[PDB]
Subunit: 425 residues, 4 copies
């Protein structure tokens, strides 16, 4: 019942392959607070990696889950259906952007969601290839590791992942890749490796998560939409991390001015319970033949009621607006800290999907991974849990529950400021 003892036991029973960002064993939690086995208290700015937008154990969510535990926990929908699954699908068909008839499939993880969205796109187009972007992250199954634009550590040592996945450039002006280069990198694929007629879908994160919290602009997204229409390519928006309200709208695509053919959701959608899904143009969704979709746990009853309560909470507690206000308050505080620390070369984010990127002496081509990691460690020592991300591990992101208290906003910003001041000593 000590963090160190538990870490020792871990090294004996669990593979080192499962990294451990923080050597801490959480015991209990509530909203933005977490207590370890030693009773220490921490402020959670990671949110279980964008999974806790309604916070740890939201009362409404927990009450719903407890009620469902009195009825049943599993039947396997495809064997014996149940209402929570159907209801969520109906609601997602409406909530997901796209002014047309849609259908929803529930699965269990973000990885499976992307897996099924691609299987569906292939069935609908009768094509086999897919295009993803540099720095993308879509999961850890063989195929999603291929879609993921990061070999190390996700696929390191395992040999080459499935082929017929082509790499396009994600637009990122901060690093010299115009939206023109991005659109041009897709045409390069068409001309050099896979003609449009062999590409079932173009998979993209409206805002890259693990990739650095880089957001696609509406104009770029609009150009991509047009490129897919022109070629009959399904546009797949992976919103496992950008969805569930993190950006100010339930789904980031709503702010792009265009609708994808398929959308995946997970993480925060159920506020702490295993659930994910795929919503898309009905005709596309129906392309797969009966019996070709499913999974044992898919749309687990408890997770479904949890998701339904999360949606009601976003409405009841005005969480979308709070995401926006929270984001502005965070960037303002971050911009202040930056006026005193050159290493911070960028402060960005839609809604509450906030991040800052660190460069050596503000040199926009000198990723400061060491400083980034130093801040994470300092924040832990001050009781703050943070996550870094980005292909160069020089991006600090904030994923604190949207239900955060005013005081905790000040507390996190303060601690962060202290970290940059104590590191510069």
């Amino acid at each position: 019942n000590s963090n160190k003892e538990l870490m020792q036991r871990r090294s004996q029973a669990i593979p080192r392959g499962v990294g451990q960002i923080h050597p801490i064993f959480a015991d209990r939690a509530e909203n933005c607070r977490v207590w370890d086995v030693e009773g220490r208290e921490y402020l959670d700015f990671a949110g279980g990696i964008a999974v806790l937008n309604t916070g740890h154990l939201h009362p409404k969510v927990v009450a719903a889950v407890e009620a469902q535990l009195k009825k049943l926990s599993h039947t396997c929908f495809q064997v014996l259906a149940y209402e929570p699954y159907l209801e969520l699908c109906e609601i997602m068909n409406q909530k997901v952007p796209g002014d047309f008839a849609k259908k929803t499939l529930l699965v269990t993880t973000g990885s499976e969601a992307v897996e099924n969205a691609v299987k569906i796109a292939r069935a609908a187009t009768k094509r086999s290839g897919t295009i993803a972007f540099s720095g993308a992250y879509h999961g850890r199954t063989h195929y999603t590791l291929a879609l993921t634009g990061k070999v190390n550590p996700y696929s390191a040592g395992m040999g080459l992942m499935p082929g017929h996945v082509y790499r396009a450039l994600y637009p990122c002006p901060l690093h010299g890749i115009s939206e023109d280069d991005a659109i041009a990198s897709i045409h390069r694929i068409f001309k050099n490796d896979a003609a449009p007629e062999d590409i079932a879908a173009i998979v993209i994160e409206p805002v890259q998560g693990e990739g650095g919290f880089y957001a696609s602009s509406p104009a770029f997204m609009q150009r991509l939409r047009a490129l897919c229409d022109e070629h009959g390519i399904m546009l797949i928006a992976d919103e496992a991390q950008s969805g569930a309200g993190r950006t100010g709208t339930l789904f980031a695509m709503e702010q792009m001015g265009v609708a994808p053919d398929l959308t995946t959701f997970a993480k925060s959608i159920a506020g702490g319970f295993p659930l994910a899904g795929v919503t898309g143009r009905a005709e596309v969704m129906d392309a797969v033949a009966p019996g070709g979709l499913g999974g044992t746990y898919a749309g687990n009853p408890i997770a479904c009621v949890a998701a339904l309560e999360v949606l009601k909470v976003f409405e009841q507690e005005n969480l979308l607006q709070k995401a926006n206000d929270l984001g502005q308050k965070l960037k303002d505080g971050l911009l202040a800290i930056a006026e005193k620390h050159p290493e911070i070369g960028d402060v960005r984010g839609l809604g509450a999907m906030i991040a800052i990127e660190l460069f050596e002496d503000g040199d926009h081509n000198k990723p400061d991974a060491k400083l980034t990691a130093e801040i994470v460690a300092r924040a832990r020592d001050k009781g703050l849990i943070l996550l870094s991300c980005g292909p160069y591990y020089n991006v600090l992101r904030i994923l604190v529950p949207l239900t955060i208290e005013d005081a905790q906003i000040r507390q996190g910003l303060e601690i962060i400021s202290q970290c940059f001041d104590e590191a510069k000593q």
Copy 2:
């Protein structure tokens, strides 16, 4: 509040890709009883497809879940660890067959488990190919669909799944495939398509589930073990369906007289909550570098305490001995019915993983898919939930909770018996 009303809403909100064995919407359940939204009661012989060996909402399991629901439901282990995960791993390391040290990785679904088992074998052997068997089922992600020995419906319209997966024959004398043919088929692969030094693993189900409840014999499994040993090939045992006590021992491999290098488990391990995992040789498990294993929901807290409680229940309530007793009563009962119906050409099963196979006029070359389907439908009319399986859809399997009461064992057999008699005239 009407099964048919709900089915209608289902067809407008959910893709046809998701099949529906029984057009019934469950509302609540307890042990082996399920009640639909109309209040009609059914006896559950499908168990959410082998996920409810401890029955629906086993009270010990639910109380554990309730206690944990008071502490936390999610942190993402890689970010902040927690005891239920660590603790289940230790238990699994001890329980899965193998006299060597093992390490366990917790994920969320059976597909993920197979996916990770293979990634681990690839990293450990530094090889890329894998071998699976005919009629096998390992999941619905691109790669596991490739391992799965069945294209339709799981892959129709989609195109070809990931390559570098070679097919071997599962031993099945009942249908002409001898143990010698099985083994010969692996050497044929070594000789024709992929040398031993390019095969990371041979994935096999000790007892094929979707494949028809065909069990491997200890003798075959031993030849297979020796063959893997000789080539440094990892033997992966997929015990998602055969595991968690279904066959009379916690894992089917315990009755094979040999131990695999890796074992994947799921479904019944958590008795109704989303969880799966991989347990294998520690040094093999540790071949993946830190950061190469993970997943957002992996080893969800709630599901972890559920699995821990399930294992305690197997001990306290003697479920393994009950499995063996249940299987004998079922097989005795089914053999009785077979005396009056020649169509029943085989009654088989280890422990409680019981199945009967139907043939037109007892002709072992004429699988009766029509009769099989009819029995399933007649049973539903009598209040019994059944599932069929096998590549020819002529196998009826029984996956009723091991916690079933004696009277319910008779009720089910009697119903099954009436279904056959009534299928005659």
Copy 3:
């Protein structure tokens, strides 16, 4: 000069990868005779591996070549056409089996022939997968090595060859593979790994060459044709080695009672000059868009007139009939030797595609690669060039020119006869 001296320079300037069956350097050859640099004379029963059906430098062929040599040796057909290429295609379109219009593509090597045949079937059916047989040999390019049913040493050390090539069993009663087993193995692929809708072609050798001179039966070929017809799959007959008269008919398929959709030809077609090609159902051949088929040396001028002359020589000199006569004399001579050597467990062959298989003590389960190799080495010391084959290197094949005189036939057989007697002493 010295054979050994040349072998030494060889080991210094050429990689060990290029094996050397006979450590002999040829200087001159004519018809069935070869003289090495040491002036020693050899009777050639290998024919450059089935490339010299009209013998070394057939005078008619040489005269045609010399005449063309005065005109031009290369222009690259795609840039400037030339009659020899056009004229050969026209003749092949009519002589290749198939009661329908055909078109012919000329390439340079048997490997390229197969490569293009598969590319054309893929473009015509719009499918990507192919099926090949156990023990098959189709070339040494990445893709043809995948089709080739033998990994060592062709693919050894290189890793896995291209995917989406599935393995069926070649019918071979001698070793336990019945025609039913072979056809069942194709359905197995359809059910387990690749649906018919995803298979562009089934590649087969009417008579396997490197595989062991195992011939397909008309009945089997007919079942395969019906199976292909039923699923829209192209039947590709690789006749690089069985073609050009070796079996008694210009192409082996003529003796099968059915026509393939595509046929690849090579080796003896040009009697000792670099040339290969693909003749097939015209609309299939035309499925590829202009600019899609090509190659620099494709249908080389000198090699085309040689091929046109080889065809005339076959008519004028009655070689098809002679192949049958030659084959009968060889099989009789070999069966007489077999009456004294039990190790000879089989004497088989269509036309002059003759082979004998050696077994230890005469046990079909004990391939005698050692005796086989001894016969080859002894025969060479006696002035007879032989080649072995088969997956277990226990097959002696006879590929001697069809233009051989009766005396060389008696002579070659005596030499072979003595080798067996001296090997037992």
Copy 4:
């Protein structure tokens, strides 16, 4: 005996997939002269696509061919070796750039050469992936089509080519790709799709042929060599078209200041006879196990003595020097014509590997293909045979034999000048 009639015959016997640049049937030729079946004469500025650097039927080469034709034309080296093959390998071990021991493999086509070079690199490094450049061209086999950086028409309609071939950007300032962009595009592959440890080789054309006659600079080639050295990746130089003295030196790599690990050669190596090969670092060439390399026609006797004679002709006639002077006279004349026609936006080339690129209104962003095509057709009408190329087909290239006469260089330039003036009237 009419071009039109032969073309009509062609449409009925040969597939449309084989495009016909010029609808002319050549009857005979000599050095740089070609006569069609109608007796019309042409000045060949295409050389059978860089295959006739020593011109059509060079008398010395023809005499060597004739002498060998009296000895033998084929035995299949790996069966019965022969001196011509051994001697050419010895010479290429010296001639190919690289101050260190080398070994040589002889195959038959430029495609097989690239196929074997990769096979060799994979065995040497024990890795499966490869990297090629945009606009590259390496052959028409499945695998070389994957390496080739152009889908249509080379591999269009056929589906997706073999995976595990990744795309980098070829340096090309003219179109905005800096050397840094090229090098960085390689790092992008290492981070996003295939770690260095999985890349067996990087394949590059010192000067892209079909790609538009774009040459790599010494500086870039040096960075590419350092990058390879650091990761253990084999650098494969494909000199099928750039080699055989086209650039002023025998091989273009000689002018790069660095040596590749493997080099492929073909086309002009044998002045118009089928031959190709791979020369590389001995230890690397030897990585393949014995028997792993081969080919029926490989290093054909007649093509070998032709290649040997071609190398002698280069030394005797000083063709390397003439290449440089030819290139200069060509550039000067083209720069002249360029002054009156702004459409000619670039005049480039190493040695005699000369090309000009056309732009609509000199606007480098508007690749003028229609004008390029017009020039080719006008030139044909004026008796000059030309070829275009480049990803946008706006590149005119000159591959006229190096043995061309001074008076014909003027004649050729005059015809081109007239074409531009007239196309602009």
